[PDB]
Amino acid sequence: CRIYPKGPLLVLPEKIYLYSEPTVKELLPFDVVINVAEEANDLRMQVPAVEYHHYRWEHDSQIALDLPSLTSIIHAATTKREKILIHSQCGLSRSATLIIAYIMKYHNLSLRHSYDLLKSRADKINPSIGLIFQLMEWEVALNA
Ligand SMILES: [Mg+2]
Ligand SMILES: [Mg+2]
């Protein structure tokens, strides 16, 4: 591919977190955990006090499809003021994409401004082009 040397970085005031691949124990404080990396171990059974979601994204997935469901999981957690972790393998591309996507809908911002917001708090984010295009699709629907 430590990147996040102090653990899961709070990126949004609504207790939205961003990380690379976790260990089991690192998952514990979170109410909702969304794992958007195919190769990243499914830790579901290992943590019963956690609403665990795994979406097996690879860098060439049609992620725009998954975005209504995924951003709804997130919005529903924020109204209940729950602690939320969104992680991938390296916490650069797939997980950042999902957050940016959230920001587009529920912060009512453009792709560009949403990216700018996350890069401002997660300096190392580097969304893949394929994923950027999937986000471009997301921007269209939200504008329809
Ligand atoms: Mg692993
Ligand atoms: Mg493939």
Curated annotation (Swiss-Prot):
It is an enzyme of class 3 (hydrolase). 4-O-phospho-L-tyrosine binds at residue 59. One of its GO terms (cellular component) is nucleus. The keyword Magnesium does not apply. Its EC number is 3.1.3.48. Residues 7-144 form the Tyrosine-protein phosphatase domain. One of its GO terms (biological process) is cell integrity MAPK cascade. It catalyses: O-phospho-L-tyrosyl-[protein] + H2O = L-tyrosyl-[protein] + phosphate. Keywords: Disulfide bond, Hydrolase, Protein phosphatase. GO terms for molecular function: MAP kinase tyrosine phosphatase activity; MAP kinase tyrosine/serine/threonine phosphatase activity; protein tyrosine/threonine phosphatase activity. Disulfide bonds join 1-90. The active site is at residue 88. The keyword Ribonucleoprotein does not apply. Belongs to the protein-tyrosine phosphatase family. Non-receptor class dual specificity subfamily. Mediates dephosphorylation of MAPK substrates such as SLT2, acquiring enhanced catalytic activity under oxidative conditions. This is Dual-specificity protein phosphatase SDP1. It comes from Saccharomyces cerevisiae (strain ATCC 204508 / S288c) (Baker's yeast). The chain holds residues 47 to 196 of 209 of the full protein.
